[PDB]
DNA sequence: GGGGGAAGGATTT
DNA sequence: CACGAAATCCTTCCCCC
């Protein structure tokens, strides 16, 4: 079982890069302007040279203000990027069939076959580099191992513009030697909660009776962790499919006026079918993000298609039914489409 | 007891 | 201060064999 996995480096922001490429070399922060205020907003990616200076997604985009006044900021988008991507999956067809698009800009190859070794892996690993840097001018960091949970880190260890193996001897060192946190899917609570065990490394999950892992991280993830540690981890390669669709906004001021709200609501309707293009969803789902970051949401399964003109009138009784319960006024809104015909 | 759908949340990338 | 989008998993509630 031999996975590849591709990582596209500092995707937003070598896109941005690839388009002028006056850029490169520059600190470049491609950013998701609010319009609160001024340079209100948060941090999409930004490229090497502002990640070493502490710029990266998730940080307002005004303390990124402070730290580079004078780096290129430039607004997200989405789109633009959407399409290269795309075009880099379809690069990507033409090394395997086995190919799933964990996200814009991640995916794993089975390569069982076209292989049989590691070292005619590292090979279309640099077949694949250079074909994409060439194609389409874009850097990518691949990882290769047994499994993708280990393909993923390889890339990780190797990133930016890297490409690693970890074969087998070293997954045996990794499982002891490994921080459990650095782990795909182990985010920074579940990290957390497994300080608490005395889980430090993915070979002490070993060391615990399952059920107070059940308990403490849900039986999932505990399958998950353990599979791993006990190196027989082996979810397999498969297309996966759009589920739902949707868009969220910010307010320009938080508030609890539904007169107020909805333009904001209707907007992200307007905006949800456009992406919706021909599917047809039978449930609506209205997401609000209250004034102190808390995610709140309602929904409805129908038993036939929403039309327009339904999600409308639905979601003004679902955002109702929001402000009805919670008295927290009310900073981003948004809706969800799932359960496509 | 346990299937199976719903809904409202939690957590991760 | 602190945007966005989508997946999967969890706990709870419910109708009913
Ligand atoms: N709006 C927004 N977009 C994000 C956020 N995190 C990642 N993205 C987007 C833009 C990133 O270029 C893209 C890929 O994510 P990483 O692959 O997580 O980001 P990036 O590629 O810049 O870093 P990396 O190549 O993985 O070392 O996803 C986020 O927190 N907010
Ligand atoms: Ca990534
Ligand atoms: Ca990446
Ligand atoms: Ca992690």
Same mark, same amino acid.
């Given at each position: ?19 002028? $490429? ?37 940080? $307002?985009?005004?303390?990124? #203000? ?8 430039? $607004? ?7 399409? %290269? ?17 964990? /996200? ?23 077949? =694949?580099?250079? +074909? ?8 990518? !960091?691949?990882? =290769?191992?047994?499994? +993708? ?10 990133? $930016? ?27 920074? =609570?579940?990290?957390?909660?497994? #300080? ?8 002490? !999950? ?5 059920? +107070?892992?059940?308990?403490? =991280?849900?039986?999932?993830?505990? #399958?998950?962790?353990? /599979? ?20 969220? %906004? ?39 993000? !209250? ?18 003109? !339904? ?5 003004? #009784? ?10 927290? +006024? ?12």
């Amino acid at each position: 079982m031999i996975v590849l996995f591709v990582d596209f480096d500092y995707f937003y922001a070598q896109v941005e890069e690839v388009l002028n $490429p006056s850029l490169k070399g520059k600190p470049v922060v491609v950013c998701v302007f609010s319009g609160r205020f001024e340079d209100s907003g948060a941090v999409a990616t930004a490229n090497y040279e502002a990640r070493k200076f502490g710029v990266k997604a998730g940080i $307002p985009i005004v303390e990124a #203000k402070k730290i580079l006044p004078n780096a290129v900021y430039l $607004p997200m988008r989405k789109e633009v990027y959407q399409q %290269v991507s795309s075009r880099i999956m379809n690069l990507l067809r033409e090394y395997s069939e086995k190919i799933e698009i964990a /996200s814009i800009d991640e995916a794993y190859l089975d390569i069982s076959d076209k292989v049989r070794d590691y070292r005619e892996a590292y090979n279309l690993g640099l077949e =694949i580099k250079n +074909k994409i840097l060439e194609k389409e001018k874009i850097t990518v !960091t691949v990882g =290769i191992s047994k499994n +993708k949970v280990f393909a993923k880190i390889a890339a990780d260890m190797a990133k $930016p513009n890297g490409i690693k193996v970890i074969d087998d001897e070293e997954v045996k060192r990794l499982i002891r030697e490994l921080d459990i946190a650095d782990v795909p899917g182990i985010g920074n =609570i579940t990290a957390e909660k497994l #300080k608490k065990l005395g889980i430090n490394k993915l070979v002490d !999950t070993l060391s615990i009776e399952f059920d +107070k892992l059940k308990g403490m =991280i849900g039986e999932a993830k505990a #399958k998950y962790l353990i /599979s791993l540690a006990r190196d027989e981890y082996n979810e397999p390669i498969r297309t996966r499919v759009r589920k739902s669709i949707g868009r969220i %906004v910010t307010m320009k001021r938080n508030s609890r006026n539904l007169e107020e709200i909805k333009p904001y609501l209707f907007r992200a309707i307007e905006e949800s079918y456009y992406k919706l293009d021909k599917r047809i969803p039978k449930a609506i789902h209205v997401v609000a993000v !209250t004034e102190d970051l808390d995610i709140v949401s309602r929904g409805r399964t129908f038993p036939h298609g929403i039309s327009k003109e !339904t999600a409308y009138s639905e979601s003004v #009784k679902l955002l109702q039914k929001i402000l009805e319960e919670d008295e927290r +006024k009310i900073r981003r809104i948004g809706v969800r489409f799932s359960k496509f015909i």
